[PDB]
Amino acid sequence: SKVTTVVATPGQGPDRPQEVSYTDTKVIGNGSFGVVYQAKLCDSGELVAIKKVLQDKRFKNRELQIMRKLDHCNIVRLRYFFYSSGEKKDEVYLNLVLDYVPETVYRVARHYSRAKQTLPVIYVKLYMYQLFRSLAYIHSFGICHRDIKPQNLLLDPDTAVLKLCDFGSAKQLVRGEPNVSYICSRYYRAPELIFGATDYTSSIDVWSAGCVLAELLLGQPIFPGDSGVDQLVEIIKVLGTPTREQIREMNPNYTEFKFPQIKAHPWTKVFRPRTPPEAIALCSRLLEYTPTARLTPLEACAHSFFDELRDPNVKLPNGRDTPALFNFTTQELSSNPPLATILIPPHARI
Amino acid sequence: SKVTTVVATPGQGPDRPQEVSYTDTKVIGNGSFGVVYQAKLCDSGELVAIKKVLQDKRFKNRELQIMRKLDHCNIVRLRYFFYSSGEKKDEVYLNLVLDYVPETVYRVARHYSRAKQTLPVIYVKLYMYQLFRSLAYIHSFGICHRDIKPQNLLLDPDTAVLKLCDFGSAKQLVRGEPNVSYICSRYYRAPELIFGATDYTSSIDVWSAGCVLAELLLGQPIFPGDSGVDQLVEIIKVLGTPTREQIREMNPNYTEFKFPQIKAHPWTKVFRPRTPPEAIALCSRLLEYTPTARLTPLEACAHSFFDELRDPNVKLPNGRDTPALFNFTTQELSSNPPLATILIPPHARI
Numbered sequence: 001s002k003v004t005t006v007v008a009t010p011g012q013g014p015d016r017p018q019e020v021s022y023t024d025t026k027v028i029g030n031g032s033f034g035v036v037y038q039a040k041l042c043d044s045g046e047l048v049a050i051k052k053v054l055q056d057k058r059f060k061n062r063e064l065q066i067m068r069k070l071d072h073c074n075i076v077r078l079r080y081f082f083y084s085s086g087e088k089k090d091e092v093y094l095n096l097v098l099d100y101v102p103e104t105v106y107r108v109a110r111h112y113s114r115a116k117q118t119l120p121v122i123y124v125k126l127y128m129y130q131l132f133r134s135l136a137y138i139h140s141f142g143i144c145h146r147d148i149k150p151q152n153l154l155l156d157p158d159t160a161v162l163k164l165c166d167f168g169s170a171k172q173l174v175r176g177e178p179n180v181s182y183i184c185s186r187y188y189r190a191p192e193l194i195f196g197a198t199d200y201t202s203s204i205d206v207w208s209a210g211c212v213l214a215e216l217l218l219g220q221p222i223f224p225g226d227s228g229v230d231q232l233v234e235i236i237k238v239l240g241t242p243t244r245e246q247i248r249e250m251n252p253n254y255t256e257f258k259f260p261q262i263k264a265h266p267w268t269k270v271f272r273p274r275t276p277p278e279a280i281a282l283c284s285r286l287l288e289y290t291p292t293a294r295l296t297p298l299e300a301c302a303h304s305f306f307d308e309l310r311d312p313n314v315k316l317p318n319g320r321d322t323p324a325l326f327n328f329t330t331q332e333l334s335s336n337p338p339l340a341t342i343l344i345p346p347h348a349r350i
Numbered sequence: 351s352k353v354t355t356v357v358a359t360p361g362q363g364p365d366r367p368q369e370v371s372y373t374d375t376k377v378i379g380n381g382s383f384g385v386v387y388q389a390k391l392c393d394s395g396e397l398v399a400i401k402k403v404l405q406d407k408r409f410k411n412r413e414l415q416i417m418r419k420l421d422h423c424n425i426v427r428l429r430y431f432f433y434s435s436g437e438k439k440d441e442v443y444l445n446l447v448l449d450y451v452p453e454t455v456y457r458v459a460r461h462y463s464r465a466k467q468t469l470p471v472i473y474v475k476l477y478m479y480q481l482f483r484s485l486a487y488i489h490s491f492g493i494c495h496r497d498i499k500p501q502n503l504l505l506d507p508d509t510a511v512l513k514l515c516d517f518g519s520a521k522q523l524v525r526g527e528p529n530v531s532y533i534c535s536r537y538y539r540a541p542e543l544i545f546g547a548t549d550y551t552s553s554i555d556v557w558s559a560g561c562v563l564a565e566l567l568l569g570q571p572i573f574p575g576d577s578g579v580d581q582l583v584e585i586i587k588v589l590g591t592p593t594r595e596q597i598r599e600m601n602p603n604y605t606e607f608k609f610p611q612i613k614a615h616p617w618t619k620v621f622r623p624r625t626p627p628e629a630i631a632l633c634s635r636l637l638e639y640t641p642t643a644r645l646t647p648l649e650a651c652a653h654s655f656f657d658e659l660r661d662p663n664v665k666l667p668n669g670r671d672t673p674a675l676f677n678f679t680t681q682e683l684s685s686n687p688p689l690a691t692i693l694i695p696p697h698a699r700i
């Protein structure tokens with residue numbers, strides 16, 4: 001087809017530009033950010049995604065700087081980057097050449113919902129564990145994704161590999177530095193975000209990941225609503241009314257404003273009867289009002305819900321082996337090095 | 351048919367309870383709030399809506415107190431109210447017996463977009479004018495609806511009467527008193543709300559009203575997005591980048607956080623070519639970054655876009671007369687009494 005040849009800089013490593021030739025340029029996404037294309041590397045025959053955003057003349061691209069720092073099996077890799085012409089004349093465009101992962105947790109969960117089915121629990125375990133590994137990794141650099149939602153979780157249906165994507169909202173969170181509260185998509189926003197907190201931490205991603213878990217288990221979003229108000233009612237219905245101190249922890253200025261008094265609903269009454277107790281236990285520990293009381297991504301990987309993945313004889317339903325699960329680095333283990341005793345099972349050590 | 355007899359207090363006037371009998375109970379809606387039923391009054395045959403919410407007696411219902419004050423032709427009337435049960439031998443429900451209006455702006459606008467059509471501008475004029483009258487009225491009492499959206503705008507398809515509903519988020523806004531920023535539904539939220547302002551005014555309803563106008567004209571929401579971030583990009587694309595003073599006016603603490611540089615897009619380039627210049631002019635004056643620069647509901651009623659409604663020969667497409675449009679009260683006119691010279695046309699009710 002129509003072959004495009006560009007001189008791109010590799011994402012990581014030495015700044016040694018390379019001629020990158022690609023064909024079959026189709027559009028796979030549009031949004032506020034710009035456009036995401038799919039293309040085939042002429043060379044390898046390999047599929048890649050090209051995220052084309054507009055170059056802000058004032059400052060360096062925040063997403064590019066973040067992408068460049070990262071190398072994880074559960075995060076979409078920045079292969080190359082280059083500058084181009086774009087849609088608007090006399091305007092500069094940044095092109096991020098990324099890994100292409102064919103499906104999204106959103107499309108997959110939606111097939112199941114439409115077919116009146118739930119995603120088999122083994123997939124919920126595989127997908128969730130991989131999400132927490134990606135979060136453990138980025139969090140270790142002080143980076144918060146800030147937009148964890150099923151649409152941002154890519155899947156390879158054959159390998160059962162999950163890859164986090166969209167670093168457009170990602171930011172390095174520094175204690176004492178304030179941050180915008182209007183980030184994060186509806187249904188997945190932590191209560192602190194709803195209350196307009198600007199002092200929130202990376203625990204917002206853990207809340208969001210818990211909302212993904214509960215949705216994969218329920219077959220629909222756990223906390224829906226078209227306003228913060230409706231979302232808060234759904235949270236209160238499940239978690240009970242937040243205490244004076246719980247509210248103080250999220251946003252302090254919001255301690256006076258009153259909410260309806262609903263009793264702490266049992267999580268066992270939330271999900272269907274054949275739901276594993278460990279799935280429920282995980283939810284309750286991820287979906288906490290107090291941001292400091294939520295599990296960390298690395299502590300969630302070590303949870304009993306993921307024990308099946310740590311079994312030596314664990315196999316995918318298609319007969320294939322499970323993907324990489326125990327190749328933890330010192331960087332990803334940094335928040336709690338002693339967790340490796342659980343994380344890396346005896347079989348992975350041999 | 352089950353006949354239910356209750357002892358209910360009339361919405362307005364003397365607190366003199368009476369026996370109200372109704373039949374043909376049917377659920378018309380479910381939400382965070384509770385349930386909305388449709389029923390028929392035995393003695394009149396009149397269809398009514400019953401909004402049933404759980405009431406904790408450790409406070410008086412805010413919506414009920416607001417409803418009881420209100421009496422406007424473009425607002426759903428509280429006919430009666432009463433207490434009953436539904437779920438538990440302690441659980442007490444407040445029941446609000448309201449006017450039943452058969453359709454919604456949401457459902458009407460959706461027929462047209464599925465049909466690849468726009469709502470004829472006469473209906474846009476009739477529906478919008480009536481919405482602004484309802485807003486002029488409530489605002490005169492210091493009450494802000496706080497949830498203006500097509501689903502909360504009811505229509506009678508035969509009379510072309512619009513009635514505002516859902517006072518569940520409504521609040522009397524007192525200057526200096528802070529308010530929650532998590533009110534108002536996605537697409538319709540004023541930028542100040544997105545920025546987490548707690549010092550916002552009734553001008554949030556005017557922003558929301560403008561979003562409804564632009565949607566009725568476009569055939570789709572003007573500022574979509576699943577996050578505040580995406581919504582803000584859509585606003586910036588249309589209104590241009592907000593100046594530091596414009597940002598200061600909305601929420602002051604967010605003056606430091608930077609946005610992409612988009613040039614002020616012409617409002618004429620936003621809508622289809624056969625859009626009336628007065629419709630676009632109205633939008634530009636409703637959809638202002640500066641809350642104090644937005645038209646007031648009463649000033650919007652007097653805009654050139656609504657002139658056709660003030661014509662003595664205007665008639666509905668079905669051959670019927672236009673509904674009540676000029677029965678303004680001193681209460682309704684209080685924000686600007688001289689506006690009545692435009693508002694009440696020469697031919698109006700003698």
Ligand SMILES: CN1CCN(S(=O)(=O)c2ccc(-c3cnc(N)c(C(=O)Nc4cccnc4)n3)cc2)CC1
Nearest residue numbers: 028036049076098099100101102103104107165166
């Ligand atoms: C060709 N088809 C298009 C329809 N889909 S989809 O909507 O399920 C889908 C959409 C995007 C991707 C994808 C693949 N690789 C990527 N690397 C990215 C990506 O980085 N996306 C992204 C999106 C928003 C902001 N930033 C980045 N997306 C995969 C499937 C199936 C495939």
Ligand SMILES: CN1CCN(S(=O)(=O)c2ccc(-c3cnc(N)c(C(=O)Nc4cccnc4)n3)cc2)CC1
Nearest residue numbers: 378386399426448449450451452453454457515516
């Ligand atoms: C059988 N159909 C049900 C589907 N619709 S609808 O969705 O278009 C519709 C929904 C609600 C009403 C309605 C009528 N009168 C009311 N008075 C209320 C009302 O007060 N609603 C409300 C909603 C949320 C919170 N508080 C109040 N709603 C009318 C049509 C048409 C008729």
